[PDB]
Amino acid sequence: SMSYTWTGALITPCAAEESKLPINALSNSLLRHHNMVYATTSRSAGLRQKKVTFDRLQVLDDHYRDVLKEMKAKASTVKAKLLSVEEACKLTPPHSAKSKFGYGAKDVRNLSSKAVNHIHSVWKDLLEDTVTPIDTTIMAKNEVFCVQRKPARLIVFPDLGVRVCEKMALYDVVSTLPQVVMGSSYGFQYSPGQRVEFLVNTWKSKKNPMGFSYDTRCFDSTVTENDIRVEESIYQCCDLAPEARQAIKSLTERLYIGGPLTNSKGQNCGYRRCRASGVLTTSCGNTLTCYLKASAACRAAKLQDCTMLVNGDDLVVICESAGTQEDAASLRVFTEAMTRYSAPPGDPPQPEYDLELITSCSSNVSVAHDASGKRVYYLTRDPTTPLARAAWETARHTPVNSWLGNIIMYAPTLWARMILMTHFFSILLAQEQLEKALDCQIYGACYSIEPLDLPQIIERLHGLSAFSLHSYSPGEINRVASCLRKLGVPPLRVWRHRARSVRARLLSQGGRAATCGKYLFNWAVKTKLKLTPIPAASQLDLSGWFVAGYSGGDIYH
């Protein structure tokens, strides 16, 4: 069937949208080539609609069904709980889209009776009605990139009342089931460092390793009614409260499978018959579906000693090589199988024999050296998008601070330490806002973070190693340097000078600020200080951080 049907009514914005990089007094210090940075807007949504609208055919064989059976057996060992209204409410981001029914995200969070009462009525309707399509809003995402222009991605989401009900029925399931079903292949369980460890150990476990990333073209669009029903049957394998079962069946039939699309003006835009990007099950359903099709495809292709790593629609496979000719042939068969299962490639997969050249979750393993001169593996990425976004965030206040998420996740990297840390700490010093908590997103979930806690966060997730890495690789150094020329970012020599100042200012304020100076900026000085475990690090509740993915799932921790 067709992934979407359209009426012709436009995908509309709520407010005016900026496409050009906003400029203030801080902009030039980060980036000179302002015309390279842009934000997607609803004005390019038509282009996206064209891309994501196609017919899906699906041919399902024994490998597919055998894997599904295996998945269901593991799923049947899961016991999941219902969340109460209150518990579900507390998982709502404070900035989440307001309800059509007279209350907003903050009314939800502080548990106002107006919000609670409507949510209760939404839940009761779900239990009582299992057929009536649930309304969704379709919007264009405003995301920032460097020119290479990408059309706006589309986001489809039900009302806030429904979203709370999703959490009630499914939060525990989507949080716990994926790891039980997929084990070590479940990508969202890993910190960046645990991800490196798993990739490195998997690579080393092969006699002659070969790996490939598989990019599905518009994965959400390739998801069929069969696929969404199949995932529900996996959910229903769980030990569940009777009301949970009913709500999940109702949400599947009324929401997850498909439904009408309404713009911000209230106009009918058409109909969806594929994955909605803005539902709680987006991450879990995509992960299960990608794992299922790929596992089956590995068997169809007779890939030898396969290990898969799956993060929603993001797939990487490591296996035993049979030489370049048989590998290329094997990947073609893999691709044919995926295509039959309705997961055809965007860019065709290519075999890689250098682990450091495999990109997965926009990232690659690379190598540097710790204090002892001991080689350490770490996760990095091309910094172009992080830096484009940091430029936007320098001149504009944003709901989500990608710079802070990036500092957390990519703390060991040369670009995050020299540029991002230096730049944004300078900004926070000048404003005296070091102590002000800011929102960031990690694996789709929203977190409120104090910048002064960064040293403890980084020590916990990465180890004290992240403050002492040196002698990065030539390929990594070249990629960063190339990126800075492209965007017109000052050379790393300027950043070292800046960091010396940022460091000194932080130290001169004592307490948590000086701790930021000492650990975060120890790289900047010639005569570095001895770095010991920070006492207050084993205190913050980092439980829930790397449990699951929640893209579009409207989750706050």
- The answer to whether 312 contacts ligand B42 (rule: CB under 6 A) is yes
Q: Is residue 313 marked as binding?
A: yes
Q: Near ligand B42 by CB under 6 A, which window of 208-216, 234-242, 263-271, 357-365? A: 357-365
Contact 418, 426 (CB under 8 A): no
Q: Which is nearer to ligand B42, 296 or 409 (CB)?
A: 409
User: Which are the contacts of 108, defined by CB distance < 8 A and separation ≥ 6?
Assistant: 89, 92, 96, 115, 119, 160, 164
Contact 320, 202 (CB under 8 A): no
Q: Encoding tokens for residue 101?
A: 């029914």
CB burial class (10 A; 0-12, 13-18, 19+) of residue 11?
A: buried
Q: Encoding tokens for residue 407?
A: 């500092």
Q: In DSSP terms, which residues pair with 157 in a beta bridge?
A: 137
Q: In DSSP terms, which residues pair with 378 in a beta bridge?
A: 366
Which residue from 144, 261, 331, 379 is in contact with ligand B42, where contact means CB under 6 A? 379
Contact 537, 531 (CB under 8 A): no
- The answer to whether 361 contacts ligand B42 (rule: CB under 6 A) is yes
Cα–Cα distance measured from residue 69 to residue 67, given in angstroms and rounded to the nearest whole number = 5
Cβ 469 to ligand B42, closest distance in Å? Answer: 16
Q: Which is nearer to ligand B42, 192 or 259 (CB)?
A: 192
Q: Encoding tokens for residue 21?
A: 């990089």
Cβ 518 to ligand B42, closest distance in Å? Answer: 24
Proportion of the chain in helix, strand, coil states, percent, rounded to 5: 50, 15, 35
Q: How many CA atoms lie within 13 A of 54 on its CB side?
A: 16
Q: Which is nearer to ligand B42, 107 or 313 (CB)?
A: 313
DSSP letter assigned to residue 24: -
Cβ 266 to ligand B42, closest distance in Å? Answer: 27
DSSP 477-517: HHHHHHHHHHHTPPPHHHHHHHHHHHHHHHHTT-HHHHHHH
- The answer to whether 349 contacts ligand B42 (rule: CB under 6 A) is no
Which residue from 49, 213, 250, 282 is in contact with ligand B42, where contact means CB under 6 A? 282
For ligand B42, the binding residues in 431-450 under the rule CB under 6 A are 441-444
Q: Near ligand B42 by CB under 6 A, which window of 253-261, 361-369, 460-468, 514-522? A: 361-369
Q: Which is nearer to ligand B42, 79 or 150 (CB)?
A: 150
Which residue from 49, 363, 426, 465 is in contact with ligand B42, where contact means CB under 6 A? 363
Q: What angle do CA 188, 556, 235 make, to 5 degrees?
A: 55
Q: Encoding tokens for residue 551?
A: 């893209």
Which residue from 283, 335, 364, 413 is in contact with ligand B42, where contact means CB under 6 A? 283
User: Residues 174-203 vs ligand B42: string with x where CB under 6 A?
Assistant: ------------------x--x--------
Going by C-alpha positions, the residue among 240, 181, 541, 522 that lies closest to residue 370 is 522
- The answer to whether 314 contacts ligand B42 (rule: CB under 6 A) is yes
- The answer to whether 221 contacts ligand B42 (rule: CB under 6 A) is no
User: Residues 531-550 vs ligand B42: string with x where CB under 6 A?
Assistant: ------------------x-
Cβ 316 to ligand B42, closest distance in Å? Answer: 11
Which residue from 42, 224, 406, 413 is in contact with ligand B42, where contact means CB under 6 A? 406
Cβ 340 to ligand B42, closest distance in Å? Answer: 21
Q: Is residue 314 marked as binding?
A: yes
Q: Which is nearer to ligand B42, 261 or 310 (CB)?
A: 310
- The answer to whether 384 contacts ligand B42 (rule: CB under 6 A) is no
Q: Which is nearer to ligand B42, 345 or 444 (CB)?
A: 444
Q: Which is nearer to ligand B42, 286 or 366 (CB)?
A: 286
Note every long-range contact of 526-535, with CB atoms under 8 Å and residues 24 or more positions apart, other chains counting: 528/468, 531/464, 531/467, 531/468, 532/464, 533/459, 533/464, 534/455, 534/456, 534/459
Q: How many residues comprise the chain?
A: 557
Rg (CA), the chain: 24
Contact 22, 75 (CB under 8 A): no
User: Which are the contacts of 104, defined by CB distance < 8 A and separation ≥ 6?
Assistant: 98, 160
Cα–Cα distance measured from residue 349 to residue 332, given in angstroms and rounded to the nearest whole number = 8
Cβ 502 to ligand B42, closest distance in Å? Answer: 21
Q: Which is nearer to ligand B42, 327 or 439 (CB)?
A: 439
Q: Is residue 554 marked as binding?
A: no
Cβ 240 to ligand B42, closest distance in Å? Answer: 23
Which residue ranges make up the annotated binding site for Mg(2+)?
A: 215, 313-314
Which residue ranges make up the annotated binding site?
A: 215, 313-314
By CB under 6 A, name the binding residues for ligand B42.
192, 195, 282-283, 286, 311-314, 361-363, 379, 402, 405-406, 409, 441-444, 549, 551
